[PDB]
Amino acid sequence: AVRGSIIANMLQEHDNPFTLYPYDTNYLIYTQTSDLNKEAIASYDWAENARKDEVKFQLSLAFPLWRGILGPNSVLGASYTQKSWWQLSNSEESSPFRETNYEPQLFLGFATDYRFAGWTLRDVEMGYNHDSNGRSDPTSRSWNRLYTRLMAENGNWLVEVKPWYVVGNTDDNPDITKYMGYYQLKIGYHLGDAVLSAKGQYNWNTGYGGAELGLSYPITKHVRLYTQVYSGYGESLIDYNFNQTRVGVGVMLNDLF
Ligand SMILES: [Ca+2]
């Protein structure tokens, strides 16, 4: 099984072609942010009527496009991660979607067994990443990245570093790196069935960045109760240059491990 190993899990053959693979965590939580970015979203006719409380969900899947492309424990894959901010409560505005970030990937991942004094580098993935909100300017936001995802585990600990390199156009948000940084650290801790996690980015040169803490616990064998506390810049593309503290509670399928 090897909990948390995205690649190793994709190597596992699925009986049914419709049985997809989880890339990142999948959740749906009701949130409430400290401050709503009404300035960057001003062009919307519901902007001034926007509420700080909204349903935030994340859909993240992986599709092994070709196993063994580069060795027994390798795989060329594609993943899809979508984070959405929805004004479900805002009935006066017909519950509009404030923001949706479409982040598909293409990569070469490997399930590894490298020893790091207790730690084990289980995943070594390298690929292309596209992240856009599918909006037509002025609210147009998008960036491309060539990254490397490294994941190691040590007992109840999980650490994943995702350094990246921006490729292509970024005119929709030229200074996106000024808030997002050059990597994404991710720490998960297994306290029995409870999973504490941390996911953040930080620009050591600009002092900008953001991070999100999370706690989960199984409600059942498949679903889990999840509480998230995001704080900082880059929650979503539109708010990449916007600071805010968002706390939310809801359900989750899979956690980082
Ligand atoms: Ca543009």
Side-chain angles (χ1 to χ4, degrees), residues 137 140 169 171-172:
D137 28 290
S140 183
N169 181 242
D171 60 15
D172 273 328

PDB file of all heavy atoms in Angstrom, residues 137 140 169 171-172, ligand 1:
ATOM      1  N   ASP A 137      -9.600  38.166 -18.904  1.00  0.00           N
ATOM      2  CA  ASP A 137      -9.182  39.386 -18.206  1.00  0.00           C
ATOM      3  C   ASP A 137     -10.336  40.375 -18.053  1.00  0.00           C
ATOM      4  O   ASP A 137     -11.325  40.302 -18.783  1.00  0.00           O
ATOM      5  CB  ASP A 137      -7.936  40.034 -18.843  1.00  0.00           C
ATOM      6  CG  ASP A 137      -7.806  39.758 -20.328  1.00  0.00           C
ATOM      7  OD1 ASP A 137      -7.520  38.600 -20.702  1.00  0.00           O
ATOM      8  OD2 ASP A 137      -7.944  40.714 -21.121  1.00  0.00           O
ATOM      9  N   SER A 140      -8.223  37.630 -15.412  1.00  0.00           N
ATOM     10  CA  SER A 140      -7.452  36.516 -15.962  1.00  0.00           C
ATOM     11  C   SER A 140      -6.154  36.308 -15.185  1.00  0.00           C
ATOM     12  O   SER A 140      -5.335  37.223 -15.045  1.00  0.00           O
ATOM     13  CB  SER A 140      -7.139  36.749 -17.441  1.00  0.00           C
ATOM     14  OG  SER A 140      -6.443  35.650 -18.002  1.00  0.00           O
ATOM     15  N   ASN A 169       4.393  32.368 -20.590  1.00  0.00           N
ATOM     16  CA  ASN A 169       3.791  33.660 -20.294  1.00  0.00           C
ATOM     17  C   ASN A 169       3.267  33.738 -18.859  1.00  0.00           C
ATOM     18  O   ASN A 169       2.868  32.728 -18.269  1.00  0.00           O
ATOM     19  CB  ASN A 169       2.650  33.907 -21.283  1.00  0.00           C
ATOM     20  CG  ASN A 169       1.974  35.241 -21.076  1.00  0.00           C
ATOM     21  OD1 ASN A 169       0.782  35.303 -20.774  1.00  0.00           O
ATOM     22  ND2 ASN A 169       2.731  36.319 -21.250  1.00  0.00           N
ATOM     23  N   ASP A 171       2.012  37.286 -18.033  1.00  0.00           N
ATOM     24  CA  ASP A 171       1.535  38.671 -18.087  1.00  0.00           C
ATOM     25  C   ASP A 171       0.214  38.888 -17.325  1.00  0.00           C
ATOM     26  O   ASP A 171      -0.116  40.025 -16.981  1.00  0.00           O
ATOM     27  CB  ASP A 171       1.469  39.192 -19.537  1.00  0.00           C
ATOM     28  CG  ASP A 171       0.540  38.378 -20.439  1.00  0.00           C
ATOM     29  OD1 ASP A 171      -0.293  37.587 -19.936  1.00  0.00           O
ATOM     30  OD2 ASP A 171       0.642  38.544 -21.676  1.00  0.00           O
ATOM     31  N   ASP A 172      -0.536  37.817 -17.074  1.00  0.00           N
ATOM     32  CA  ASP A 172      -1.792  37.916 -16.329  1.00  0.00           C
ATOM     33  C   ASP A 172      -1.521  38.183 -14.855  1.00  0.00           C
ATOM     34  O   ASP A 172      -2.399  38.604 -14.102  1.00  0.00           O
ATOM     35  CB  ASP A 172      -2.570  36.610 -16.440  1.00  0.00           C
ATOM     36  CG  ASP A 172      -3.457  36.561 -17.656  1.00  0.00           C
ATOM     37  OD1 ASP A 172      -3.958  37.628 -18.065  1.00  0.00           O
ATOM     38  OD2 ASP A 172      -3.671  35.452 -18.190  1.00  0.00           O
TER      39      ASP A 172
HETATM   40 CA    CA B   1      -4.007  38.680 -20.312  1.00  0.00          CA
END
